[PDB]
Amino acid sequence: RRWFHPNITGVEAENLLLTRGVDGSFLARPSPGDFTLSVRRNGAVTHIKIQNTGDYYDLYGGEKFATLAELVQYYMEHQLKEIELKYPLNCADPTSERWFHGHLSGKEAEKLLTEKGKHGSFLVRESHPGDFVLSVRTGKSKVTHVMIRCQELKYDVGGGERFDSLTDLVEHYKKNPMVETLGTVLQLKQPLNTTRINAAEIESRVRELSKGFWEEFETLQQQECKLLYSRKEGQRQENKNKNRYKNILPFDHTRVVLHDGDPPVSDYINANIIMPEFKKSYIATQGCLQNTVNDFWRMVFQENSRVIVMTTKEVERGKSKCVKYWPDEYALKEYGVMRVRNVKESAAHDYTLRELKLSKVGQGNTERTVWQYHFRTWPDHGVPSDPGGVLDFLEEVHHKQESIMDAGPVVVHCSAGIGRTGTFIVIDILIDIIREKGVDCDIDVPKTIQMVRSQRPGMVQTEAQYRFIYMAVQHYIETL
């Protein structure tokens, strides 16, 4: 993912592409949640705007994607008009690397590696001004410091190969470890963790990030190229029109597989099982289309789901984000083989609750109650100013879920089923930790996100949602 340049101005991007690039050379950069794709064509530079309001990356004059990496993979392998993406123009900046610590002292580094690190835990820090230091833990346990010289724009450890960036140096010494005079192997197994905080410390960490949040978010984004898993099933011709956005697809390994279909390609839904890994599970899905309503109810039936979380209005800015897949209050409707009764609707301030009864037609004893929590007050763009509303909603949802024996995964959807959907699920996972363990437990916001993003692509879209998750968790701790 070297083609993303986090601290480059438009003019710097142009000059870099004109002096170090060729035609088909490209880079991506941040602007507010806006990004630019800069490409060289006919010895000139075209800047393509990519917007993200919270739901997806919307490439102007192109399509919608779950991640910038999936956007770059799509155009490199394929469509882009006023433009070919051929050569990634590599960024040499280490700011968004998990191993980079910038201004950090030797003793501070050793203390961090002693308290937080294990065998193979490493970091890169500033030194000899201009130079760098590789501090690595092995194991009795020990910390070893290796001097990184910066010489005429290249990096080296005293001899051998001179590297164009700290990243190339680290990737080379990761695969080819340094061996010490007395036989110690300086294995670079994993970067030092800096984001795992204790829940009681939330407020302090949030004061630090508010000075921050952007840097911590971009380092998480720099890990998305590890999550380019296969999405073949959504790509099939017969599944294309089952997707709200042609390129926003489920991963094959965690997709919900629909069984007992009408006897051609009856097993597909744009949905992924989200299993927290470190008690409830989730199904993150898109808002139904007219042609997927029946599939949606087939999923809820098969997965034994007793609770649905809807985090969008049906219509936002005159565009359908989700079709009404539930009957009118007191009405009964059939969706293929599935029968659904809207028993009662209860209107709260931030949401509506719909009590539904789902059963299979021809078998009356298959009936079960599905509780639909329709969160109605999320802003059209951005995130709520206060997390209180989202928090009371999740507490109601949790308690409903817990009150039902053998209830299947909680169904969560918005429009694409990645941004608001990811935000609510990650808030829910983190608050579940704090509910059963209290203030005395470790929480790691970007690690939980990366774990959820490995199950459905693009979970948690913006820096605004990222910060909102931290505000929600801090608020939940504050009100215990």
Side-chain angles (χ1 to χ4, degrees):
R1 200 189 190 255
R2 297 278 299 269
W3 44 263
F4 189 78
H5 296 233
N7 300 292
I8 206 159
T9 65
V11 245
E12 273 172 24
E14 278 201 333
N15 292 155
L16 214 77
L17 282 168
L18 288 159
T19 58
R20 278 124 77 89
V22 289
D23 290 13
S25 276
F26 74 97
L27 63 83
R29 48 184 177 92
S31 174
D34 276 7
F35 301 87
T36 305
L37 173 66
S38 298
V39 199
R40 192 172 157 176
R41 44 132 260 113
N42 286 19
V45 189
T46 177
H47 300 277
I48 305 104
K49 193 199 191 284
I50 309 158
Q51 196 180 74
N52 196 324
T53 61
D55 311 312
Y56 42 68
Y57 291 96
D58 179 0
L59 179 70
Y60 288 39
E63 277 149 4
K64 286 161 192 182
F65 303 88
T67 71
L68 285 171
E70 280 180 12
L71 184 153
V72 164
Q73 179 177 244
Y74 180 85
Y75 293 111
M76 272 179 85
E77 296 177 333
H78 291 240
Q79 302 309 98
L80 192 60
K81 307 127 186 164
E82 216 93 30
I83 314 153
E84 332 148 302
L85 303 193
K86 293 180 174 186
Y87 314 104
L89 204 141
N90 279 17
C91 180
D93 183 43
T95 56
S96 297
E97 301 286 335
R98 303 183 296 189
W99 43 253
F100 191 76
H101 287 242
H103 183 252
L104 197 82
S105 166
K107 179 121 173 73
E108 299 185 299
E110 286 194 300
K111 265 176 166 277
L112 283 183
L113 287 170
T114 301
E115 294 159 4
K116 277 252 189 140
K118 63 186 100 288
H119 171 74
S121 281
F122 74 97
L123 66 89
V124 183
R125 65 187 167 88
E126 288 180 335
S127 185
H128 309 109
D131 277 3
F132 294 93
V133 201
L134 196 170
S135 296
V136 56
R137 166 154 174 180
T138 54
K140 220 81 217 158
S141 275
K142 66 169 169 199
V143 165
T144 309
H145 307 295
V146 172
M147 298 304 154
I148 303 170
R149 288 200 74 170
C150 184
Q151 272 176 295
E152 293 255 46
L153 298 144
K154 291 197 179 181
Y155 308 93
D156 58 80
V157 295
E161 196 164 62
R162 299 216 298 141
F163 297 92
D164 276 329
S165 63
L166 283 178
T167 304
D168 295 302
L169 184 151
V170 165
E171 289 314 297
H172 173 79
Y173 289 105
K174 235 168 188 176
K175 275 77 249 276
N176 308 285
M178 284 165 285
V179 193
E180 293 209 291
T181 317
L182 270 153
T184 281
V185 193
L186 309 168
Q187 296 203 318
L188 317 181
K189 233 106 166 196
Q190 64 275 313
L192 181 71
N193 184 294
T194 180
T195 63
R196 171 176 72 253
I197 55 158
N198 170 266
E201 265 193 300
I202 196 60
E203 229 216 304
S204 183
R205 182 51 51 105
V206 167
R207 278 194 281 272
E208 293 187 275
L209 295 158
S210 293
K211 281 173 168 71
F213 284 118
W214 186 76
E215 272 140 271
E216 201 182 76
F217 185 63
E218 276 321 310
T219 297
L220 166 60
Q221 298 296 78
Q222 204 59 50
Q223 292 153 71
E224 94 200 357
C225 264
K226 282 98 176 178
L227 311 172
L228 292 154
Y229 307 134
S230 68
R231 293 168 304 130
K232 301 177 175 103
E233 298 301 306
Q235 275 168 316
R236 293 217 249 161
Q237 176 60 41
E238 45 260 299
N239 292 332
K240 218 309 294 149
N241 288 341
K242 297 163 186 166
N243 304 315
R244 195 161 261 288
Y245 306 99
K246 68 173 283 291
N247 305 290
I248 302 174
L249 308 172
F251 287 144
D252 293 331
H253 72 290
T254 55
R255 71 175 191 111
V256 171
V257 181
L258 304 181
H259 308 113
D260 310 283
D262 177 66
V265 170
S266 55
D267 83 341
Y268 183 83
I269 183 153
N270 194 318
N272 294 94
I273 303 276
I274 309 306
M275 282 182 271
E277 191 230 322
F278 300 98
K279 203 203 188 290
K280 76 164 86 74
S281 54
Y282 312 85
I283 289 160
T285 189
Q286 60 177 33
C288 314
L289 301 154
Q290 210 191 47
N291 64 293
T292 74
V293 174
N294 301 350
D295 294 324
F296 182 90
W297 285 107
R298 273 178 70 212
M299 175 177 68
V300 176
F301 194 84
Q302 173 188 302
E303 301 300 311
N304 191 34
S305 303
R306 306 309 181 83
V307 184
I308 299 158
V309 173
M310 178 165 178
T311 62
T312 180
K313 290 165 184 85
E314 290 156 47
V315 181
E316 293 187 6
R317 308 278 176 82
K319 299 171 279 180
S320 168
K321 300 303 183 215
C322 181
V323 302
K324 178 187 161 78
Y325 57 88
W326 67 90
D328 288 358
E329 183 174 31
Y330 307 129
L332 179 74
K333 243 189 108 68
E334 289 183 1
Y335 303 102
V337 309
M338 299 305 159
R339 193 174 273 140
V340 186
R341 189 182 295 272
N342 181 344
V343 169
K344 186 85 201 81
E345 298 198 0
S346 304
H349 187 96
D350 297 300
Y351 72 93
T352 299
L353 172 63
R354 302 189 181 93
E355 181 185 344
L356 316 167
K357 281 185 186 190
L358 167 67
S359 60
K360 205 170 177 159
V361 320
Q363 35 218 76
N365 246 328
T366 63
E367 201 173 54
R368 85 282 316 277
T369 308
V370 186
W371 304 90
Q372 185 208 39
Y373 287 88
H374 183 173
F375 192 93
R376 303 176 285 101
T377 59
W378 191 279
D380 293 333
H381 289 345
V383 298
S385 290
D386 139 275
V390 156
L391 291 173
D392 170 84
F393 178 79
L394 289 176
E395 200 77 25
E396 241 329 288
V397 173
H398 171 83
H399 285 103
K400 182 64 69 167
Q401 175 70 8
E402 240 200 73
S403 83
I404 312 155
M405 193 84 196
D406 298 324
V410 173
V411 171
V412 183
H413 66 90
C414 53
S415 56
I418 61 182
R420 291 181 199 179
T421 295
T423 300
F424 277 79
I425 296 183
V426 167
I427 292 188
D428 198 55
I429 290 163
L430 297 179
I431 295 330
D432 217 285
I433 304 165
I434 309 157
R435 203 185 281 93
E436 87 117 82
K437 293 187 161 188
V439 102
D440 291 298
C441 62
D442 289 322
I443 71 147
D444 197 342
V445 168
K447 195 199 218 174
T448 300
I449 297 180
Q450 185 70 357
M451 174 270 288
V452 171
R453 287 183 170 177
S454 75
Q455 296 182 74
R456 179 168 178 83
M459 299 290 269
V460 184
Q461 284 286 295
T462 63
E463 194 249 279
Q465 286 164 350
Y466 187 79
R467 165 181 218 273
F468 181 80
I469 293 174
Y470 261 108
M471 295 308 155
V473 181
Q474 166 187 258
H475 186 103
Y476 178 84
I477 290 159
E478 275 170 351
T479 70
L480 275 174

